[PDB]
């Protein structure tokens, strides 16, 4: 019964724990507090999804780098523009598109938290934007039995 916001946040937390010094950006701490985060980043569902997204990232490493750098350098309103991209992808859905979006969001969070020169507000509004935009998948995921069912049986 976990929401997309919870699983994406847990994935971003897990990704940070296995990258850099393992410390969490204050933004991810906040999101976990404000989002009633019930899902552990070490949960098997999170670990299993993390591999799928990492595989998507590596297979499309350059495209993810290009798309993100084009996104973050041309935006004047980070969090709102995350919604715009989300709506364009899901014109209206498939498992591949869900995972493609989630991997792109995890990659963005990784890049933002790994570069110590990124301003706080850029990290803050990006994480908020991707988590709030991702809420649009709850309806579809619910009809597929939840994120746990998709990975454990599909």
């Amino acid at each position: 019964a976990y929401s997309t916001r919870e699983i994406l946040l847990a994935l971003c937390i897990r990704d940070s724990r296995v990258h850099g010094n393992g410390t969490l950006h204050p933004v991810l701490e906040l999101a976990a507090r404000e989002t009633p985060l019930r899902l552990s980043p070490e949960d098997t569902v999170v670990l299993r999804y993390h591999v799928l997204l990492e595989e998507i990232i590596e297979r499309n490493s350059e495209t993810f780098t290009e798309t993100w750098n084009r996104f973050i350098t041309h935006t004047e309103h980070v969090d709102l523009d995350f919604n715009s991209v989300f709506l364009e992808i899901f014109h209206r859905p498939s498992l591949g598109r869900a995972l493609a979006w989630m991997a792109w969001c995890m990659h963005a969070c990784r890049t933002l938290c790994c570069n110590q020169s990124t301003p706080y507000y850029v990290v803050d509004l990006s994480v908020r934007g991707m988590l709030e935009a991702s809420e649009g998948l709850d309806g579809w995921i619910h009809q597929q039995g939840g994120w746990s069912t998709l990975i454990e049986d599909n």
Binding site: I56, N60, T63, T67, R70, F71, H74, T75, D81, S84, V85, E88, I89, S94, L95, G96, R97, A98, L99, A100, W101, W104
Partner: peptide
């Protein structure tokens, strides 16, 4: 703008690629 549309196009594409598996 253009940037948001190009991103959406690429991610839809890569998605269809993973659906092919």
């Amino acid at each position: 703008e253009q940037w948001a549309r190009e991103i959406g196009a690429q991610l839809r594409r890569m998605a269809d690629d993973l659906n092919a598996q």
